[PDB]
Each structure stands twice: as structure tokens, then as C-alpha cells.
UniProtKB/Swiss-Prot annotation, chains C, D:
Co-factor requirement: Mg(2+)
Keywords: Lyase, Magnesium, Metal-binding
Sections of the chain in a coiled coil: none
Active site: H186, H286
GO molecular function: galactonate dehydratase activity; magnesium ion binding
Protein known as: D-galactonate dehydratase
Gene: dgoD
GO biological process: one example: amino acid catabolic process
Length: 374, 374, 379, 379
């Protein structure tokens, strides 16, 4: 069995799918993070395919290590994202060849179902409430909201108060019936960080995600020593050494490794087991497509320390087996089909790739602002 | 091109200007810190001019290093202040020779405008409010006030309460509409430090500047671990090693390097870039004259991590290009003219130097009190 | 305002990539990213970063650097920082030509008059290395860099330690203390064999041991250095200032070697050099093989007081795309400051284009057991 | 109350500055700031600090010391602490004369009967150094200080390491373990060459290695000391007690050498010596060349139990402005306690004035590459 071809497909949202074909006619699918540097990531995939074409896809460990360390410097945001997509597809192949879901190869189930939380948006606080009340009747009680009331940076007491007032209004609609985490995207100024966290404390969010962009992991420990609220982080980390430093410093209660960024299944299973050695909950980050979500589920269903799973609900378009990702009580069931358990509509992928379409945010003073999402 | 002459000029407030002349007729201006030891600083300048006369002013790096390390022990408060003034003038020369503002030589703009805050005084709390309300209609919303209600030391609960009552009355006049930082000048006793900071917390100042005079940088970290309020410091630091120790200990959210004290542009650009490596905002300290303010602006407009700029508004007297330092919305624009962007009235400098004029504060017990400002 | 119009890349024969940034006032800057091994990815990175550049004023290098670094994506890494490094070199080249001066003049002027260089010497046998060293020595050189291992492969046996030492011993016998050499091991020593190799190399007094192991933790270098009197050199695998700070905070590295074509260019490397000054370390920039990036290195050396040595690769081959070859001539192992405005390279653009037409494109080395060896410069 | 009337400074020929503090009861004290290299700045500092002194009671030395140190300006630094040191010496001189006793009597009395001295020996060649050492040895000396390097310049090569060692080796052969010598390197060793030089000096057993490198971080000394059995001496570049505490907290310095003319005078140096006692360190004050400041050193030695050695520079030249020369005579390398009230110096004021009329006024040394070398005592 040998790898024959790699193809990438840019798709209408901020998605890229890749397809690994083999001489046995077994096809794997992976999904890299691209938001922002789509053409670079695409080039990385095709450069790394030199190490794959005519190799046995079953040696995932060998292929992972070759891509990561054998031909270049160790990967950062671009290469680790490319390696992640390829890794996902090799696992898809392996599970298809052996006729079982990926979690079965990785020791089998450690749980029967997995708790999920959803991201909820809205321009007004009333809009956010409405969306949460909709998903609540659907069966959810765990949510993730943007902490930022408006677009920009939290600079002033006035900006802190407005952000807290929004959170207050949202909390008063539910009390302790629902849980929500707040993601600030690192868009809080260093002087405001501690006062904001303190002002949110009465309204008790489940976590605070990325209050600031840390240069040293000591600042998360310094922030956490001030608050009862759990600090969540991990989406901007790729190396195992990024995670180890964050975990050894402490101050991060909830770790959020992205499957599509941190080197894939091969690597995220290791990050999960490293997280166990510290007193830290695991909540794998994935708001991407269906291939990457499925990849996350396989890590969730083998790692005992995984507690919550992020999903963005769209990703039902390119998948034929939509019912496998149905949610009851805010819980997802294990993938059912061999490999990653996603039946990809290859034809609908091919046709929509034929059409191919992020701005710079700046402060008032004109200075460039650190990257966030929409 | 060669340096021909250095002249110092003592001026009516607590200011000294220096003037570096060249054989091409290109003149640079610098401004050292002197408050207090004016004759010593003046002597330092003229002793260091032995390393300058007949040298190419373009080798600022060489001249800086020669002054700092080649003929004596490494500088403290006096020599670093002298070096700072000379450094500013060599940068003024260089920018004049190449016909561009200083920030252009240092990589160009990282921002379009710079946020400023002003110092506001007043004997009564009502006077302080009035001055703030005046500048607010002018366009300001960021201020810096003395924390000390009266002249002396914060020793007692009665002294803490009076200082907090003053701050309370000021805050109630504005709410969260304006921001203000409190400068205590290190005039709080070590037992009172923590209770005062805690009592000010409801009224949420933007920062607390120099609550105590630290002997070890561990005490700022110990103070900051107790409070949500940001600790600002840096005006009493000269060496890069003073700043590094403060930054590595943590507990200082806002760094305040003085351009006219910490070795000038050559050195403060380095302090700025070092501050980036820690999670610390930069607010360069300058309440002096127009040459030093201009020098600060050039550091602000090249360093991404600079957030607020102190200005004392007088310094419009000796400058012919007053409109270049106009403030809209509490924002300053980049310097426009070559060099530092200050057109110095040399004649008005020369004539007012012909007339040349700080007391010891003591506690009740007779003991000498650590230096502060008026 | 002056506006950037176009970025163009040129893959060239000794696996180099040249970058050309054009402006609408006819002023052109040149940059050089290092591409070894991932040429197409870096090329794609350069063109994607150009989106933040076309139509913008090239004089705002700080703004543009920050925009490329943090605005549209996650920070840093070996691909993006190499791309940013090349753009940075060209932007500063523009700034110097506009203001009619070399880059070092903008960065505060000269801190020295000339810069000590050293070169890498090769050869399979010690006799060859000696001869090459003597050939350069007659031309005034007395500082050198060598590979620590005779051929490709990991040092994981006493036999391999002994053979590496014997080679170095024989090289040392021909010169005594009359020359200095550093030894680069490219991280190809097993962590069990590291301390014994280092110890066995002590009587032969190399100036440094560069990259003995690939350190996962920063404390690794500090533990090696506490065992030996020999200086440890590192830096080429570090891409952000914050990677450099960590290693400097741990101690154990005596000589820091930032790459100008990898660690974000002049803008970031002047800050790295400044950061290193607050530690007891010597600075010796890991300079890439090409001339544009060599020029970038020199500008950093001529403004950083703590810069002591400068690696370069001269033959007869580096000076082919450069018309002003005499500006980079060496006397007594020293290079003069760049003379022409900007980076100080007059680039033969017509040769660059000519040879970009004829340039084609990953050597993966494996241990005897079949597992991949971590990548080395030997490729 | 008794009032200070006047301060007067006197620049004198071997680049010394004497300070004279007068009172309205006719009691005069003498002090000595070290000025090397910034004479006019320190002179101006002394006269500006006099503003806090004129009209004040000289007996309140603690109040006055604190006033000069913290009241009117930012603290400390090499200029102000040297000026404060000179004023402190004179104030205590006043106090001792008023109470009719030596300074050590005020500071708790004698802790020893005599103080072990050592002297610096010079000479370009080892043969000269040996001869000078033998000349002092015949006079009962057995402890010495030498410069570690043959001439001015940085040790940055194996060749320079080897030559420095060979010199020390040859000096050691003439004596064996019969004499002790320390080696001062004045911070003129590159941080890569530091550990190898120190290691190569171990068989020749110097009593200490003084200032091998200029430590940016305090951890530098601790890292050097963990490699060697040789004691590291430091202290001359430290001006505040808090600089001393940091270095002592880091460890790695076995012998602390505070300068009495630089670190705030007697008032601060007795506290520095007290602070050092709580660490496993020997105290050996870096005494300046002049006699007034030498007297100040002795008073600290004769009250501090942890003071072990005392550096002095005797010919034939130190004793010129001192009338009571026999009070500072040496027997077997030992000095007796000062005998006269105050600091114990009878100052020939009329010679001081005479020679102050005829005294004129910065040697900047550069590396081969043209950059400035960090300042050394050799100037
Ligand atoms: Cl990467
Ligand atoms: Cl000073
Ligand atoms: Cl990257
Ligand atoms: Cl000083
Ligand atoms: Mg997030
Ligand atoms: Mg202040
Ligand atoms: Mg190398
Ligand atoms: Mg000495």
C-alpha cells in the first residue's frame, strides 16, 4: 500500500480540505487551519507531500517525524498546521484499512459520550440571550461567548464596565442554570486585565479564555493567583514545549489544544497525556470544519481528562453522514464509520473549490492590533 | 563633519539646555535632568565633551559607548543624565543632516498619533476637579494626580483615609468617563502600603505610581499580588540592569523610563524593546522641557508597546514651532521638522541663561525624608 | 506618500532566494530570506505578506514589520520569520537609498571601524582541513569554524567520540594556539554522549562548541556549560526574541548567533543584540551564505557593541550577483563598513533574472535502525 | 551648637583630591574622594553637597550622611558616593578630634591589634615583578597583588590566555608556596575566555582572581565560582550596600573588596563589612592610593572582625602630605592602629595648598576593530 497523490481544496468559508489517495483506492481526508495564510499553508502541504508519495501510509509515526524534523527546522504555525492536516488523513486511511473508527486504534473508548459547548454570537446582549435560549430548548447548558461587547480593545474603565454590564445582563437571564465561558481574544490591555477579571467574578463565567497575549507563561500564573475564575488557553500553541511551559508555570485551568494546528492526532494525544500530569482540564479547541471536529472527537474519546468539546453550530454541507454528529443533551456520540468517521462528499468538494475568494485591525492611534477572529 | 563646541544653559525653571555645534553649522539640542544637582550635571556634560570635540557626531553609538564605559565607572544618576542630554543632541544633528525626523532613522512610524495624559494639581479636591474639567473640555480623559492630599508622609490610618477621601471626591465628579493615575512619590510608609492600595481600589485609578521606595524589586511583586491596580514605576532607574531586575521580578504593569535620565534615545529605544519581552505597558516619563518631550515622542512613535505619554501642560517659551506639539483629543502628532523637531529660540535661550537662581524635607521626628517633587 | 508597487522573488542556483521590493519613485530595495529546504513555502509566504505592503509607505518599517508579524495570523515560526526577514532587509535598503546613506548610519552610526570575520573551512580528512586553513591563514585569517564530525551521522558511541576528537587533535597539532577554531556539531550528538565529547575536546581548546545537542529545554545548555570551560554557541534555530530571552535567562550559552535571514531581519536583530548586552554573552550573527543578507549582518555588527565575530562564506561564489565586489573585500580577516546607500549591495538584476529562469528545486537522512535523523545543515 | 563653616577641595598631583572641612571651633577634618577620571564632576558634587553642611552640626554624621544620600536628589552612583565618602571621612575626623580619640574607638574599639597588609607589585616582564616582590619580601611581605595581564588589552585568545598563564607560572616558580599573590584582571577577559583562563591558573594557585569579567548579572560570578577552586574577588565597582547585598546573595565571590572612597565612606563601609559577616566571605577593602582614605580603611579594618587583608600602595610617595609618617609604618607586612585623634593623619596643609596651585587635569583605549574598551584601572 502506497500514497499516490495529495490534493488540496480551498472551500467557500475559511476552510481547506486535503485528500490523500492510495494505490489500494483508500482515501483519507484532513483539514488544516488556514485562517489568514491560506496560500502558504497550501504550499507547505505540497512541499511535505514529497515525503509521502510512494510511502506506506501505515507508518504514521515515521511520516509524522519526517515532516516535523527531518528536512527543515521544527515547525511553527504554518508547518504544524500542514502536518496536522496530513496526519488526520493518514489516520483516516489507517482506520479505513482496518475497518474501525480511529479511537479504536488508540486503545478504545474511555467514555460513552462527550460533553459539548457551542459558541453563541449577537450584536446586542438581548441577541446573545435569545440564541442561548434557543440552544437551551435544544438541550445545551454550556456556551462560549465573546467577552468583547464591541470591536476593538479593552482599554478603559468605561470599556471594562460596558463589557461587564453585557455579561451581567446575560447572566441575569439564566442564573446558574446555564454555564458560559468568556473569550476575550487577548484584546484586553495589561493594566485592565486584573480589574476586568475581578469585575466579572460575581457573574461567574465557566472560564476566561485568553485575557491577554502572554509573552511569558508567568503572567497566567500571576493572573490566576488573583482570581477564582479558571483561565483557559492553548489555541495559539503548536509545540509540545509551548504547552509544557504553560502547564509548568500553572495558572491555566483549562487547556485548549487545536487538533488542526498543534500537529494533529499523533501530537494531540500526547498533549492530552501530558495535561494529565498537571491538575488541568482538557477542552480541545475546534470551531472549524467537520474533518477537524471528528479528529477532536477521537482525542476526546481516548483521553480521560477531556471534559468539554467546542463546536461551531456550516460543517454539515460536505458531510454525508450528518446524523453521526447529532447532539442530545449537549452530548456527542463517538464516530461510527471507519477512519475519522466522516463521509466526505468529494464531488461537492471538487465543484466548490473552483470558486476561490482577512483585513488589518488597527487601534485609534494607528498602531497595528494583534490578530483576532470575526 | 566634526563637533566643535558644547555649551550649557541654565534656564529660569529647573531646566538646563545643552547645545552641540558642528563645523558644518548644524546645531543639536539636548536636555538633561538636573533637578537638584545642577552644577554637578553641568560639570559632567563638560567633562564628557572631551570625548566629543573633533569627533564625527554621526557615530552616536560609538560616542554613547565611549561616554558610558570607556573613561570611568559606568554612570549613575549624574552621568546618565549628562549622557542623555548629549545623546539627544547627536540625534538632533543626525536627523538635521539627513533632513528627516528622528523616528524616521529608527525604522519609521509604528503609529499615526500618540495618546497623552497630563498632570493636574490643586490644593483642595475641588481645585483638582476644576482643572480636570477644564482639560476635559479641551479633549483630555487621561490624567495624573498626586496621591498625597498634603505635604509629607502617609503614616497613619487617618492619613490613609484622608488621601482616599480626596480620591473618592475626585472620582465621584466623573465616574468612569475619565481615567487618572495616582503618584505617591514613594511617600507611603511600608506598613501602610497595602491598606492604602486596598482602600483606593473601589475608586479604580489607572495606576499607582511609586507607592514605596523599593530596595528589592520583590516588593513590587508582593504589592501587585495583593491588588488588581497596576503599579507604575521607572523614573528612578538609569541602567538597563535596573529595568531588567524590575521587569523579571514582575509586579510593575506600566514602565516609566525617563529619556532625560536613562541614557537618552540610544538607550530608551533598547529599554522599550526589552519591555516588549515582558507583559508590560510602556509610558515614558517626561515632565520636563520641550527638547526632552520631543525625544520621548520619537521613542513613542517607533515602539509598538508605548501606550501613554506624560506631558506637563511652560515648555512653549523656547520653541518657535509650538503648533507641532498641539493636542487633539489628548493625542499628539509625530514631530515634523528634521532632527528632534524642535525649533529652539537660541537668542531667547542665551539671554535668559544670564539670570541663574531645592530645600530639605524632614519628618516630625527630625529625620531626613526621601526626595520628592513640588 | 511614496508607495510600494511590487514584490518579486527569484530562486537562484546555490539554493538562494533574492527578494526585490519596488516603489513608485523608482527606488528599489533587495532582501534575502533563507530558504534551505522549504523554498516554495517561504516564497508563498513572501507573496502573501506583500498584501500588507502594496500601496503602503515603505518608510513605516516598524508599522509594516508589526503588521507582517502579528496582524493577520498567529505569530512567528521558521517560515514567516524568514519571509519577514527578507522583506525587512529590502525595506531598510529602500530607506537608506532614499536618505542617501548606509543602513548603519540610520541605526545610530558606527560603533566600530571594522568587523572581525571568520570563515567555515571544510574537508573530509584533517589534512584537507589543515591545508584549507593554511590557505586562508596566508590571507591573514586566524579564526575559523569547522564541523565537529568527519562525516554525516550522529555521535552516539565512544568510538565516534574518539574519532571526532582525534580529527580535532590532529588539526590542532598543525597550529597550536596560533589559530582559533569553533566546532559546529549541528545537534548531531546523543545527549548521553554530549558531556564526554565536550570534556574530551577541552585540551584542544576550541573557541566554541556550536549546537552540541538540540535542546528541548533551555536548562539543557546550562547543565552542559556547568560541566565545561568551553563556550557553548547557539542561536541559528531561534526565530523570535522571546526564544532568545529564554535561552539567555537560563544561562549556559556564551556566544549568541542570531540569523538575520531567519530571526525577523535587521529590525528584530538589532533588538536581539541589545537584549544580549544585558547578559554576559558575546554576539556573533549566524550569517547566511548570500551577499544581501551578509550586508544586513554587517549593519547589525557595525551598530552593536557586543558583536565580536562575524561568520561568512567566501571562496569566488558569493560575489557573483554583486557588482561592487571590492566593498566586501577582507584585510587581515576584517571587513569594512558597507559604503553604498542602503544595504550597500549593487545587485546585478539582469544576471539575477537570467539565472532565475534556470533554477530547479529535500535530503532526508536516516539512522541505521531506519528512523529519521533530525535535520542538519549538511544537506 | 558647633557649626561647619567651609568645605575646600584640593586637586593634587598623583591625581588625588583632598577635602578640608572646617568648623567654627577651629576643628578641621580631612577627607579623600577618589576622582580618577572625572575630577571636575566629583569636585562639583562635593561643593553642591556642602549646601547641606554649612551651618550644620558636624556631630550629626548619620543625619548629614542621609541628607547627602537621599534628601535632595536620586540616590547613589559613582559620582555622588565618592563625594559623600570624602565628606564622611572628614566628618568622622572632626568627631574623633573633638572627643580626643581615634575613629576606631568611637566605632566600638579594636577588634584586633594589627592589620595584615599586602601591596600591588608591577613590572612589564616577570623578571621585574619577581625582583620587586623579592625587594618587598626582604622587608617582611609575603602577600602581594599583581595584574593578570602583561600589558593593556583584552584576553580573547588562547594565545593571550597562554601568555598570561606563562607569566604567572614563571612568577610562581621563583617562590613556590612561600608567597601568596592575587591576580587582578580589571574585567579585561572576554566571557568566552573566562573559564579557560581561570582553569589554566589553578595549578599556580593565586590567592584570588580579582574582577575576571565585568558581571552584568550577579549570577555570573556564581557560575564562574562553581567551575573553580580559586576565590573570586570583587567590590571596587560597587557603590551601594544594596549592590553588595545582591552579589553576596548570588554567591560566587569569596573576597569582598569595598572601596572606602567610593562606597559612601566609613559610615556605609562599616555596615557593608557587617553585612558580609552573615555570608561566608572574607573582607579586604579596596583602598585608594591616598593616605587620608588609607586611614579611613584602617579604622574599618580595626573594628570589623571579618576584615582579613588590606591593600596599600607604598613606595615613598603616599607619605608626602603626611607629617606623622611613622604612624603608617609597616612591620612584617602589618600596620598598627592609627594613633592620633580622628583619622590619625597630620596633614601638611601648607604643602597641600602649595601643590594645589600647580596641578593640571581621560585615556580612552580601543580594540583593534576600533570600538571602545571598557575602562580599566591601568589608565
Ligand atoms: Cl512554520
Ligand atoms: Cl553618576
Ligand atoms: Cl512560520
Ligand atoms: Cl552619581
Ligand atoms: Mg479564542
Ligand atoms: Mg513620580
Ligand atoms: Mg551551525
Ligand atoms: Mg582592582
Amino acid at each position: 500500500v502506497k500514497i499516490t497523490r495529495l490534493t488540496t481544496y480551498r472551500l467557500p468559508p475559511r476552510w481547506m480540505f486535503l485528500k490523500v489517495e492510495t494505490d489500494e483506492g483508500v482515501t483519507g481526508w484532513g483539514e488544516p487551519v488556514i485562517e489568514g495564510r491560506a496560500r502558504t499553508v497550501e504550499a507547505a502541504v505540497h512541499e511535505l507531500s514529497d515525503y509521502l508519495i510512494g510511502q506506506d501510509p501505515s507508518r504514521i509515526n515515521d511520516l509524522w517525524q519526517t515532516m516535523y524534523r527531518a528536512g527543515f527546522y521544527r515547525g511553527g504555525p504554518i508547518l504544524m498546521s500542514a502536518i496536522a492536516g496530513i496526519d488526520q488523513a493518514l489516520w483516516d486511511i489507517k482506520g479505513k484499512v482496518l475497518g474501525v473508527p480511529v479511537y479504536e486504534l488508540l486503545g478504545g473508548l474511555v467514555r460513552d459520550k462527550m460533553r459539548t459547548y457551542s459558541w453563541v454570537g449577537g450584536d446586542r446582549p438581548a441577541d446573545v440571550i435569545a440564541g442561548m435560549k434557543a440552544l437551551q430548548a435544544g438541550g445545551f447548558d454550556h456556551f462560549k461567548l465573546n467577552g468583547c461587547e464591541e470591536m476593538g480593545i479593552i482599554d478603559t474603565s468605561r470599556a471594562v464596565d460596558a463589557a461587564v454590564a453585557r455579561v451581567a445582563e446575560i447572566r441575569s437571564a439564566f442564573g446558574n442554570t446555564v454555564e458560559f465561558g468568556l473569550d476575550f481574544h487577548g484584546r484586553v490591555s495589561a493594566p485592565m486585565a486584573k480589574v476586568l477579571i475581578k469585575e466579572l467574578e460575581p457573574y461567574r463565567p465557566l472560564f476566561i479564555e485568553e485575557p491577554v497575549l502572554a509573552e511569558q507563561a508567568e503572567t497566567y500564573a500571576r493572573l490566576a493567583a488573583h482570581t477564582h475564575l479558571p483561565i483557559a488557553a492553548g489555541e495559539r500553541m503548536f509545540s509540545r514545549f509551548d504547552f509544557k511551559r504553560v502547564l509548568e508555570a500553572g495558572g491555566v485551568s483549562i487547556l485548549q489544544p487545536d487538533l488542526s494546528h498543534a500537529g494533529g492526532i499523533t501530537e494531540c494525544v500526547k498533549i492530552a497525556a501530558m495535561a494529565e500530569a498537571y491538575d488541568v482540564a482538557l477542552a480541545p479547541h475546534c470551531p472549524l470544519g467537520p474533518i477537524a471536529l471528528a479528529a477532536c472527537l477521537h482525542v476526546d474519546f481516548v483521553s480521560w481528562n477531556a471534559t468539554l468539546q467546542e463546536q461551531s453550530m456550516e460543517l454539515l454541507d460536505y458531510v454525508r453522514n450528518k446524523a453521526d454528529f447529532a447532539l442530545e443533551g449537549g452530548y456527542i456520540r463517538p464516530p461510527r464509520l471507519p477512519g475519522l468517521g466522516v463521509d466526505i462528499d468529494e464531488a461537492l468538494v471538487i465543484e466548490r473549490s473552483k470558486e476561490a475568494p482577512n483585513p488589518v485591525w488597527r487601534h485609534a492611534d494607528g498602531s497595528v492590533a494583534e490578530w483576532a477572529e470575526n
